[PDB]
Amino acid sequence: MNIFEMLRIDEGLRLKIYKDTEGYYTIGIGHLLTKSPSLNAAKSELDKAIGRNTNGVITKDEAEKLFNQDVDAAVRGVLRNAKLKPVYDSLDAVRRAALINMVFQMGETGVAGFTNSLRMLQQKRWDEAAVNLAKSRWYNQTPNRAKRVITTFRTGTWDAYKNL
């Protein structure tokens, strides 16, 4: 297990434009295109993202290319954020992947707002952090996925992803 495998499980793989859990146009491995309700707008973003006139369908290779870019960007955002970096730096590799997961899902800004949870994580108060994490819109809207991530922070193991 690693961040790529983890996110591939949490995000799936779809080669045609579809709507994510929030109703937003996405493609590939959780690559958010736009929050716009306009499919055309989404197609335009896709084309720009891939570098070609696609008409809403991409190849597996293409999907993976955006995925790699997206994971990289997530990590990059964590390292640049004053709130996140310190936590990230304080974590072991498994846990670091769980934080990246959250950032891919909600963005730098969104995770940076989990102030209290972040603090518990930096204090290495696993159970408490887990409890706190669950008190969020994130957990309520995507409970199975959140549970997986939370378990990862709680245990520092990949048990939640084991066998998926």
90: annotated binding-site residue? no
Q: What residue 70 binds from K ion, Cl ion, none (CB within 5 to 8 A, per partner kind)?
A: none
Token couple for 76: 């990059």
Q: In this structure, are residues 11 and 32 in contact, taking their beta carbons and an 8 Å threshold?
A: no
Q: Which residues are catalytic?
A: 11, 20
- Residues near 118 by Cβ (< 8 Å), separated by ≥ 6? 83, 84, 87, 111, 112
- Least separation in angstroms between CB 38 and K ion: 20
Residue 62 found at the interface with K ion (CB under 5 A): no
Q: What residue 163 binds from K ion, Cl ion, none (CB within 5 to 8 A, per partner kind)?
A: none
Q: In this structure, are residues 12 and 29 in contact, taking their beta carbons and an 8 Å threshold?
A: yes
Residue 11 found at the interface with K ion (CB under 5 A): yes
Residue 30 found at the interface with K ion (CB under 5 A): yes
- Phi, psi values for residue 51, rounded to 5°: 85, 20
132: annotated binding-site residue? yes
The binding site for K ion (CB under 5 A) comprises: 11-12, 30
Which residue numbers belong to the known binding site?
32, 104, 117, 132
